Design a protein around this ligand. Sequence first.
Ligand SMILES: Nc1ncnc2c1ncn2[C@@H]1O[C@H](COP(=O)(O)OP(=O)(O)OP(=O)(O)O)[C@@H](O)[C@H]1O
Ligand SMILES: Nc1ncnc2c1ncn2[C@@H]1O[C@H](COP(=O)(O)OP(=O)(O)O)[C@@H](O)[C@H]1O
Ligand SMILES: Nc1ncnc2c1ncn2[C@@H]1O[C@H](COP(=O)(O)OP(=O)(O)O)[C@@H](O)[C@H]1O
Ligand SMILES: [Mg+2]
Ligand SMILES: [Mg+2]
Ligand SMILES: [Mg+2]
Lengths: 370, 370, 387, 151
Amino acid sequence: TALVCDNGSGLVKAGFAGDDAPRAVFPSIVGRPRHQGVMVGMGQKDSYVGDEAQSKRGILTLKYPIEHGIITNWDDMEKIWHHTFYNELRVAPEEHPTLLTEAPLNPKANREKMTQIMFETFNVPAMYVAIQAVLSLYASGRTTGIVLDSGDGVTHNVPIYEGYALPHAIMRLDLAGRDLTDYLMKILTERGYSFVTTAEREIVRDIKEKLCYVALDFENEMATAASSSSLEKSYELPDGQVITIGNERFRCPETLFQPSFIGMESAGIHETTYNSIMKCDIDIRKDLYANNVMSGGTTMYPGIADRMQKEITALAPSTMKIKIIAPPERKYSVWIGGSILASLSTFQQMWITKQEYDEAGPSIVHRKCF
Amino acid sequence: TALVCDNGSGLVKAGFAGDDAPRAVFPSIVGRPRHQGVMVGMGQKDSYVGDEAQSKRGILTLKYPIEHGIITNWDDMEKIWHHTFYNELRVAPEEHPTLLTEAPLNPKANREKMTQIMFETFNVPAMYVAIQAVLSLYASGRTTGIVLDSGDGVTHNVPIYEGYALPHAIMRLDLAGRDLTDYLMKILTERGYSFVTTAEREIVRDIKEKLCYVALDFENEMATAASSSSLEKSYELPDGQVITIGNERFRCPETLFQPSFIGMESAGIHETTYNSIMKCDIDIRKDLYANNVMSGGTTMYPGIADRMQKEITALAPSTMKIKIIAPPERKYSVWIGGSILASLSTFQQMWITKQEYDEAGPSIVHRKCF
Amino acid sequence: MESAPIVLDNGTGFVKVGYAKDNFPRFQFPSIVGRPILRAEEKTGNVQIKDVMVGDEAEAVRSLLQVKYPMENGIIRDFEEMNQLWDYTFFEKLKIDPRGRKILLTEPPMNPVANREKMCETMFERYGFGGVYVAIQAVLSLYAQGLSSGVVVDSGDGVTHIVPVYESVVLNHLVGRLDVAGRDATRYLISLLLRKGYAFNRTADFETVREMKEKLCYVSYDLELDHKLSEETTVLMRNYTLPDGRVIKVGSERYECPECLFQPHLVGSEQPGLSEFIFDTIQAADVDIRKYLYRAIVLSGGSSMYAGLPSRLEKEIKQLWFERVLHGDPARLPNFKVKIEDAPRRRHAVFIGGAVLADIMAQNDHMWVSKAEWEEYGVRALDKLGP
Amino acid sequence: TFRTLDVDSITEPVLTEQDIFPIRNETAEQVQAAVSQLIPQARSAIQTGNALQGLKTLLSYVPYGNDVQEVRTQYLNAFVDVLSNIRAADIPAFVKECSTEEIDNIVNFIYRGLANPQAYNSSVLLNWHEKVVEISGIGCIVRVLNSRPDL
Ligand SMILES: Nc1ncnc2c1ncn2[C@@H]1O[C@H](COP(=O)(O)OP(=O)(O)OP(=O)(O)O)[C@@H](O)[C@H]1O
Ligand SMILES: Nc1ncnc2c1ncn2[C@@H]1O[C@H](COP(=O)(O)OP(=O)(O)O)[C@@H](O)[C@H]1O
Ligand SMILES: Nc1ncnc2c1ncn2[C@@H]1O[C@H](COP(=O)(O)OP(=O)(O)O)[C@@H](O)[C@H]1O
Ligand SMILES: [Mg+2]
Ligand SMILES: [Mg+2]
Ligand SMILES: [Mg+2]
């Protein structure tokens, strides 16, 4: 056996290698009680994790211990790690080799401390810690292609050719589902719906997961919404009130194609796919327009693949075929690729392990994890 | 002359462009009698507004048609606007173009109905609806700053640089003088004083305006209040009854820096201002620290600028030069700024005229106004 | 009897007293103190009146007494008379020596601090209790339900107060007082009967109209229907015989008296009534917990006991959500679930919940404020008793 | 204000009369035909001077329903016309030979007659009421109080 997880910026997902889906999947959250007053004869935790924090949330401050794919609260990550091991998977981590993940172009200390606490606090025999896009090329029978991932807190483009990564062309964008949730929270204020509390971020995230879509032609869709109510829909709040939503349900996702909507002076989602293909070498680029995969939960919107198709068709030379690849397992494909890599017939020798880590320290991880 | 009307959430302020103070300033209140027992023919009527509602308040139920910067009662807001024009300014509004004020991140229907009533009921030649915080900047003789406006119902931060606003970095908090008056009515119960009528709310607002102050260091003022009556003060009720107030003088304003005192999950005004400048780009982050403009009557407390300075300098890096810009006229700065703006030569082409309203309907306000 | 913690609901209208694990008050009696009077009234050698007479000894004999109440609106107005209630409670009701005992006391959520301070001082320095705990009355009424969430509304003689609780966290910013309760309803019944030419101005007659109200008043479910039964019919008319033997006729006053809970303007208050005070409180809670507060609106205290009050309250909250949330659209009203919890024992839910909580903390000696802790910290020893 | 909004009428639907009384197992045109066969017999029995047999035949079936007021009022016109043509000396001998169900139908339809004096002669209906209650007792009125509302 081996244990694999995407230590997600907003959604932890975890399980054993060679399973076809993660057995645990829960919010990347630690919650703490917001009010001082209690029924003194009754028990409360100091703090709460995952689905327990998410369901308790009406009395809690909710903190994500990861922001933009960077571990920001190490003291809370030890709790969500402990929750994956001792509450969700119900393992003894001292018996299992482990596979973790991170985004490319991350802080070097992030890779170090997640190496350090796994050995010194969870006692694991071994681990590895892979690039999320490099895992996401597995779970498609593939060795060449460009992978676009959008999780909760990070978007990134990674070109791969024949099993070789091209780090000159790899690039990361600090927009994903967190920023799209914040921007939905903002543009619903325009209807007079106020969402402010850390708990209300989650019901806005649920509206974003259920109601939103990418418009194929934004100016014409915006004029369709201005002329007709026929694209408006309803959501039911947890108190039983009903919320109507219209042009804001496609203005939110379109922020990937226009980052200027959140004041970000940066290139759009199609422009970063095109610019990273155009930054690849002159021959190996020639099928990336025909071999481009979407991954991570922010790529789940209806219409996003059909939008990506027309946008890179408008940018690229028409001399060659243009597609998009968008599996229904999009939101798990990072973990499915980890489940494959941790069960691959050449990989059982590849881990960082105590016999080397006990003298090299956490400075070992950069020597074989890319 | 153009009119300038500040649609204050607790206090209406009205006058003529090019004047250097409001001609009229009065409570944004409509009062109705709480008794059916009457004198026949005796100057006695279904509603009172402004200074009649305050001077008659013991026999009235008072309600503000604005809560948290949003007009919640349109039938009584039109009485307040009628009173500004025909009774306070003593003008026919159909002769004078009117500058109006609005809070950022309001419902768009608030600004639509506000342009609709002005043309469809007050017959104005032209009108405009500026965000309050840019007017407070123009009142202070500068084109760079971060404006902390704090009125009766709202407090908000607008970063602005070289005359360009940064709308992604705007912050809004539904906590100001209404919530501080509520919390003072609450904590005065601990002294044994019961204030529960909408008239006693106006007595407790006067206690708050006369005697409350911001502690420079709160837990030291708490230890000082526990040690001596030198911190305590006396207040003359309208009854001739004498009230004594102590740590309630600074526990009331501390809510502005600690919203959790009223159960509200928020950053205080220091952290809100810091996160607003920290959401602007790094070259602008050098300058707005030297230009924290304070505005509105809830920024008027004794000690607030010095403690706002000692808090914001603990969050900012130690190399920064920080200034809090807190004029003695700050109560009126959004009106004084509107009086300047409505007097500018280049502003006269950017009013909304009655002609372009008839050609477009009330949705024109979103293409003409920020 | 037992070495258990004593529990004392020293309420504004009635004292209730007993011990941890008691399923009901061991004693309950009026929180009244009497002084000897003569009043152009009946006298006999078959009784003797002492210079202070209190509780049941006063209430059975009140024609002979100047009746006074040591409490009003949930606060002690006179500690010299409250000392006479506490002497009676311990020394001749319970027949106990307080020395070194632990006692659980109760008060409403927004009192002056001087009330709790001088009450705890009295327990340590008149009676010599070894420890004290002071509990918020409405959180005890939730312990009696065996329940960890819901909005609990307690209406007694002095104050009506509301405490939202979710998942055992008490929502302290949402707690409130409606300063209308059983004494305001009794003063209003005196005012309504005065329009019919009756008079009840003697201090002994306040307990007479309290018993009349408590027997004959009810909450109208539908005001225009009770006004129709009142103005078109004689069916609401009822006779009451006073302890004098005098007979009085009462009609509309039976529904018009307790209506001051649902319409406080009838007693001169500007506050919203029960349904609108409860609705404004739940509707101020966070979106994720409003359903759990509506599904458990827990009634408590004697002024919750009027016939039809649960029915009127449930209706009037459905009706207020229909106005202020649905704006008069019927289509979603069946989906709104509210449940008033209206137990038979609910007049005593504060005592019954105090007898539960006092058992939960009986062995946890650190949970109580100690006499040894009071004598070194003074009033700062009470900072243990929540925020 | 909220006090006057009827929530009960939509949150707790009350019992209907067809929840208390079973539905009529015949269609409107089926009962209208069945009465239209009887009214000509009831009219014909007056012309032969056999108005007692006119009632005994008319009373063999009764229309009911809120969908049949036209044929219920035609049946009531025939019933009051038949009762007006029976001699007052024949009533005691006829009432004692009616079944409890025929008596229940007579006392029900004299009650429908007494409700509309501008159409129907109350003087003969009150004479029939006196004799039917004298011979069959109070319980026949108790059965009318308890009877179906669409009779
Ligand atoms: N059946 C009833 N109908 C109406 N009123 C009632 C009924 N039973 C009790 N009351 C009233 O309730 C009040 C006493 O209730 P309770 O014991 O809960 O008050 P308390 O605890 O002493 O007062 P408080 O909690 O405000 O300090 C009296 O006004 C009494 O007349
Ligand atoms: N159906 C969906 N449509 C749009 N967004 C979705 C959908 N399902 C989930 N999401 C988004 O997925 C994001 C999380 O993606 P995920 O792959 O789980 O990121 P991570 O694992 O790195 O934390 C959330 O921000 C959420 O808003
Ligand atoms: N000197 C003062 N100290 C503290 N609070 C003040 C002072 N002067 C006025 N206020 C508060 O100012 C608030 C009104 O401010 P204002 O800027 O006029 O608000 P608004 O424009 O939104 O109506 C009131 O809540 C009042 O209590
Ligand atoms: Mg992930
Ligand atoms: Mg203002
Ligand atoms: Mg009580």
